[PDB]
Coordinates of all heavy atoms in Angstrom, one line a residue:
Chain C
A158 N 123.9 82.5 83.7 CA 123.0 81.5 84.2 C 121.8 81.3 83.3 O 121.3 80.2 83.1 CB 122.6 81.9 85.7
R159 N 121.2 82.5 82.9 CA 120.1 82.5 82.0 C 120.3 81.7 80.7 O 119.4 80.9 80.3 CB 119.6 83.9 81.7 CG 118.2 84.1 81.3 CD 117.9 85.5 80.8 NE 118.8 86.5 81.4 CZ 118.7 87.0 82.6 NH1 117.7 86.7 83.3 NH2 119.5 87.9 83.0
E160 N 121.4 81.9 80.1 CA 121.7 81.2 78.8 C 122.0 79.7 79.1 O 121.7 78.9 78.3 CB 122.9 81.8 78.1 CG 122.6 83.3 77.7 CD 123.6 83.7 76.6 OE1 124.8 83.5 76.7 OE2 123.1 84.3 75.6
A161 N 122.6 79.4 80.3 CA 122.8 78.0 80.6 C 121.5 77.2 80.8 O 121.4 76.1 80.4 CB 123.7 77.8 81.8
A162 N 120.5 77.9 81.4 CA 119.3 77.2 81.8 C 118.4 76.9 80.6 O 117.5 76.1 80.7 CB 118.5 77.9 82.9
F163 N 118.5 77.6 79.5 CA 117.6 77.6 78.4 C 117.6 76.3 77.6 O 118.7 75.9 77.2 CB 117.8 78.8 77.5 CG 116.6 79.1 76.6 CD1 115.5 79.6 77.0 CD2 116.8 78.7 75.2 CE1 114.4 79.9 76.1 CE2 115.7 79.0 74.3 CZ 114.6 79.6 74.8
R164 N 116.5 75.7 77.4 CA 116.4 74.5 76.6 C 117.3 73.4 77.1 O 118.0 72.7 76.3 CB 116.6 74.8 75.1 CG 115.5 75.4 74.3 CD 115.8 75.7 72.9 NE 116.2 74.5 72.1 CZ 115.3 73.9 71.3 NH1 114.1 74.3 71.2 NH2 115.7 72.8 70.7
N165 N 117.2 73.1 78.4 CA 118.0 72.2 79.0 C 117.3 71.6 80.2 O 116.6 72.4 80.9 CB 119.4 72.8 79.4 CG 120.3 71.8 80.0 OD1 120.3 70.6 79.7 ND2 121.2 72.2 80.9
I166 N 117.5 70.3 80.5 CA 116.9 69.8 81.7 C 117.8 70.0 82.9 O 118.6 69.2 83.3 CB 116.6 68.3 81.5 CG1 116.0 67.6 82.8 CG2 117.8 67.5 80.9 CD1 115.4 66.3 82.7
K167 N 117.7 71.2 83.4 CA 118.6 71.6 84.5 C 118.0 72.9 85.1 O 117.7 73.8 84.4 CB 120.0 71.9 84.0 CG 121.0 72.1 85.2 CD 122.4 72.2 84.6 CE 123.5 72.2 85.7 NZ 124.9 72.4 85.2
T168 N 117.8 72.9 86.4 CA 117.1 74.0 87.1 C 117.9 75.3 86.9 O 119.1 75.3 86.8 CB 116.8 73.7 88.5 OG1 116.2 72.4 88.6 CG2 115.8 74.7 89.1
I169 N 117.2 76.4 86.9 CA 117.9 77.7 86.9 C 118.7 77.9 88.1 O 119.8 78.6 88.0 CB 116.8 78.8 86.7 CG1 117.5 80.2 86.7 CG2 115.7 78.7 87.7 CD1 118.4 80.5 85.5
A170 N 118.3 77.4 89.2 CA 119.1 77.5 90.4 C 120.4 76.7 90.3 O 121.5 77.2 90.7 CB 118.3 76.9 91.6
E171 N 120.4 75.5 89.7 CA 121.7 74.8 89.5 C 122.6 75.5 88.6 O 123.8 75.6 88.8 CB 121.4 73.4 88.9 CG 120.3 72.6 89.7 CD 120.0 71.3 89.1 OE1 120.8 70.7 88.5 OE2 118.8 70.9 89.1
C172 N 122.1 76.1 87.5 CA 122.9 76.9 86.6 C 123.5 78.1 87.2 O 124.7 78.4 87.0 CB 122.1 77.2 85.3 SG 121.5 75.8 84.4
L173 N 122.7 78.8 88.0 CA 123.2 80.0 88.8 C 124.3 79.6 89.7 O 125.3 80.3 89.9 CB 122.0 80.7 89.5 CG 122.4 81.9 90.3 CD1 123.0 83.0 89.4 CD2 121.1 82.4 91.0
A174 N 124.1 78.5 90.5 CA 125.1 78.0 91.4 C 126.4 77.6 90.7 O 127.5 78.0 91.2 CB 124.6 76.8 92.2
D175 N 126.3 76.9 89.6 CA 127.5 76.6 88.8 C 128.2 77.8 88.3 O 129.5 77.9 88.4 CB 127.1 75.7 87.6 CG 126.7 74.3 88.1 OD1 127.1 73.9 89.2 OD2 125.9 73.7 87.3
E176 N 127.5 78.8 87.8 CA 128.1 80.0 87.3 C 128.8 80.8 88.4 O 129.9 81.2 88.3 CB 127.0 80.9 86.7 CG 127.5 82.3 86.2 CD 128.4 82.2 85.0 OE1 128.0 81.5 84.0 OE2 129.5 82.8 85.0
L177 N 128.1 80.9 89.6 CA 128.8 81.6 90.7 C 130.0 80.9 91.2 O 131.0 81.5 91.5 CB 127.7 81.8 91.8 CG 127.1 83.1 92.0 CD1 126.5 83.6 90.7 CD2 126.0 83.1 93.1
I178 N 129.9 79.6 91.3 CA 131.1 78.8 91.8 C 132.3 78.9 90.8 O 133.4 79.1 91.3 CB 130.7 77.3 92.0 CG1 129.8 77.2 93.2 CG2 131.9 76.5 92.2 CD1 129.3 75.8 93.5
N179 N 132.0 78.8 89.5 CA 133.1 78.9 88.6 C 133.7 80.3 88.6 O 134.9 80.5 88.4 CB 132.6 78.6 87.2 CG 132.4 77.1 87.0 OD1 133.1 76.3 87.6 ND2 131.4 76.7 86.2
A180 N 132.8 81.4 88.7 CA 133.3 82.7 88.7 C 134.2 83.0 89.9 O 135.2 83.7 89.9 CB 132.2 83.7 88.6
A181 N 133.7 82.5 91.1 CA 134.5 82.7 92.3 C 135.8 81.9 92.2 O 136.9 82.4 92.7 CB 133.7 82.3 93.5
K182 N 135.8 80.7 91.6 CA 137.0 80.0 91.5 C 138.0 80.6 90.5 O 139.2 80.4 90.6 CB 136.7 78.5 91.0 CG 137.8 77.6 90.9 CD 137.4 76.2 90.3 CE 136.2 75.7 91.1 NZ 135.7 74.4 90.5
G183 N 137.5 81.5 89.6 CA 138.3 82.0 88.6 C 138.4 81.2 87.3 O 139.1 81.6 86.4
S184 N 137.7 80.1 87.3 CA 137.8 79.2 86.1 C 137.2 79.9 84.9 O 136.3 80.7 84.9 CB 137.0 77.9 86.4 OG 137.0 77.0 85.3
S185 N 137.7 79.5 83.7 CA 137.3 80.0 82.4 C 136.0 79.3 81.9 O 135.5 79.7 80.8 CB 138.4 80.0 81.4 OG 139.5 80.8 81.8
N186 N 135.5 78.3 82.6 CA 134.3 77.6 82.2 C 133.1 78.4 82.3 O 132.0 78.1 81.8 CB 134.1 76.3 83.1 CG 135.1 75.2 82.7 OD1 135.6 75.1 81.6 ND2 135.5 74.4 83.7
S187 N 133.2 79.6 83.0 CA 132.0 80.5 83.2 C 131.9 81.5 82.1 O 132.9 82.0 81.5 CB 132.1 81.1 84.6 OG 133.3 81.9 84.7
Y188 N 130.7 82.0 81.9 CA 130.4 83.0 80.8 C 131.0 84.3 81.2 O 131.6 85.0 80.4 CB 128.9 83.1 80.7 CG 128.4 84.1 79.7 CD1 128.1 83.8 78.4 CD2 128.2 85.5 80.1 CE1 127.6 84.7 77.5 CE2 127.7 86.4 79.2 CZ 127.4 86.0 77.9 OH 126.9 87.0 77.1
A189 N 130.9 84.7 82.5 CA 131.4 86.0 82.9 C 132.9 86.1 82.8 O 133.4 87.2 82.3 CB 131.0 86.3 84.4

Side-chain angles (χ1 to χ4, degrees):
Chain C
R159 204 189 330 279
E160 297 199 316
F163 193 77
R164 280 177 63 97
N165 184 29
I166 175 167
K167 193 174 183 183
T168 313
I169 177 67
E171 307 174 38
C172 301
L173 180 59
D175 293 331
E176 176 72 49
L177 259 52
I178 289 175
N179 285 327
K182 186 185 304 178
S184 177
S185 295
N186 289 329
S187 57
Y188 179 95

